[PDB]
Design an enzyme around this catalytic site. Sequence first.
Site, mmCIF file in Angstrom:
data_model
loop_
_atom_site.group_PDB
_atom_site.id
_atom_site.type_symbol
_atom_site.label_atom_id
_atom_site.label_comp_id
_atom_site.label_asym_id
_atom_site.label_seq_id
_atom_site.Cartn_x
_atom_site.Cartn_y
_atom_site.Cartn_z
ATOM 1 N N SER A 39 0.858 -1.197 0.000
ATOM 2 C CA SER A 39 0.000 0.000 0.000
ATOM 3 C C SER A 39 0.888 1.238 0.000
ATOM 4 O O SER A 39 1.725 1.374 -0.906
ATOM 5 C CB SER A 39 -0.997 -0.088 1.157
ATOM 6 O OG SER A 39 -1.742 -1.285 1.106
ATOM 7 N N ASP A 64 -8.363 -2.800 -7.231
ATOM 8 C CA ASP A 64 -7.884 -2.551 -5.878
ATOM 9 C C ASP A 64 -8.903 -1.736 -5.077
ATOM 10 O O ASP A 64 -9.470 -0.758 -5.570
ATOM 11 C CB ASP A 64 -6.534 -1.832 -5.947
ATOM 12 C CG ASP A 64 -5.947 -1.576 -4.590
ATOM 13 O OD1 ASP A 64 -5.226 -2.456 -4.084
ATOM 14 O OD2 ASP A 64 -6.224 -0.496 -4.027
ATOM 15 N N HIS A 114 -7.186 -5.832 -1.391
ATOM 16 C CA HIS A 114 -6.142 -4.841 -1.117
ATOM 17 C C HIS A 114 -5.028 -5.457 -0.270
ATOM 18 O O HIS A 114 -5.304 -6.022 0.792
ATOM 19 C CB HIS A 114 -6.730 -3.609 -0.408
ATOM 20 C CG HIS A 114 -5.768 -2.467 -0.278
ATOM 21 N ND1 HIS A 114 -5.073 -1.956 -1.353
ATOM 22 C CD2 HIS A 114 -5.384 -1.740 0.799
ATOM 23 C CE1 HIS A 114 -4.302 -0.962 -0.945
ATOM 24 N NE2 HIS A 114 -4.472 -0.812 0.357
HETATM 25 C C1 LIG Z 1 -8.390 5.543 1.634
HETATM 26 C C2 LIG Z 1 -7.617 4.969 0.486
HETATM 27 N N1 LIG Z 1 -6.230 4.711 0.827
HETATM 28 C C3 LIG Z 1 -5.222 5.317 0.200
HETATM 29 O O1 LIG Z 1 -5.386 6.164 -0.664
HETATM 30 N N2 LIG Z 1 -3.966 4.912 0.615
HETATM 31 C C4 LIG Z 1 -2.749 5.296 0.107
HETATM 32 C C5 LIG Z 1 -2.494 6.041 -1.037
HETATM 33 C C6 LIG Z 1 -1.178 6.193 -1.168
HETATM 34 C C7 LIG Z 1 -0.286 6.846 -2.147
HETATM 35 O O2 LIG Z 1 -0.580 5.580 -0.119
HETATM 36 N N3 LIG Z 1 -1.611 4.985 0.688
#
Ligand SMILES: CCNC(=O)Nc1cc(C)on1
Length: 351
Positions: free
Chosen positions: A145, A253, A297
Amino acid sequence: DLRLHLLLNTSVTCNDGSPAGYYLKESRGSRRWLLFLEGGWYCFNRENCDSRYDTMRRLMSSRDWPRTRTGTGILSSQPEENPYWWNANMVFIPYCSSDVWSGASSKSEKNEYAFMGALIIQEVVRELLGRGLSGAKVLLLAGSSAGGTGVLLNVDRVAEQLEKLGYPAIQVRGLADSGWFLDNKQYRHTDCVDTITCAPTEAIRRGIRYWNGVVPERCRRQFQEGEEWNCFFGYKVYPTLRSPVFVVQWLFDEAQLTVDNVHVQEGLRLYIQNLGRELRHTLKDVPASFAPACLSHEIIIRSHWTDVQVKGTSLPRALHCWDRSLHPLKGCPVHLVDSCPWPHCNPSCPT
Ligand SMILES: CCNC(=O)Nc1cc(C)on1
Ligand SMILES: *[C@@H]1O[C@H](CO)[C@@H](O)[C@H](O)[C@H]1NC(C)=O
């Protein structure tokens, strides 16, 4: 278990000024080292960082960290759970900088929080060299992530750091899991007025200024000043990298769909099918990749990470084939991208 070591250089800190650190499990019989970057979103102004400090404090501070952690998935030392690198030296680097591993700013009279993700990675590498990393043959920088995006932002800096420190024989490589995002058209739209409404491009642009964020030099030179937010998007930064990088990405994702404001009628069906096609398109010229057609995810530190297959090949197998290719191979592939167009059209998707 992996054992905690707080950094000896206490000027390299988590958000609140407490020392950063790493968890380590050594394997004296091995010259392979795996350094994994934890994920967990990010914050980009005083107000939303303050909220994170109340309910996600372990991602901003080391004061409550436990003395040990259990390695799971690719961090497991049991071959039953980890067919790939079970005998490697294992390092887990906690994410306590809230800056997608890009920051280089200290807590000070003008900064309520420190954002030192890029410096945390460099200091972990430096202190590990005295604990056996000096004799390594491969250093694999992995992450999930926000940590997967962190691999893309930092893998070439670790390579340059080890060259300059006088260890040219260590081969540096990257493994980016669930950090390959698209700045695509969203399914519903709002202008950036607070945290929830602010699209990833606008949030990252503000974050870089708040963090003093840094990006790889060749990407910075392409997009130039004011436009460094582009380098947080995998399909734009990957062509500028010199170290070998293996990309793992679900085609649908869950974090991507969340930032696209998706939570089925014709309009949404077409939207979801086009997202899958766009993702596949961006991976066409990525020779080492694993992209199953699932709604999910993260993958690589889950205990049952060995279960999913693309074209009959598991992720531990594809990574082993990647290892062999860095010494195309009969029956041992490294480019594995589903072509079917809907979530869970691959029967091996996680339940
Ligand atoms: C709520 C959705 N999560 C993210 O957008 N997470 C992330 C995005 C990036 C870049 O790093 N973590
Ligand atoms: C501690 O880390 C900071 C940030 O990288 C660096 O400027 C400083 O030289 C380091 N101190 C020592 C003693 O290595």
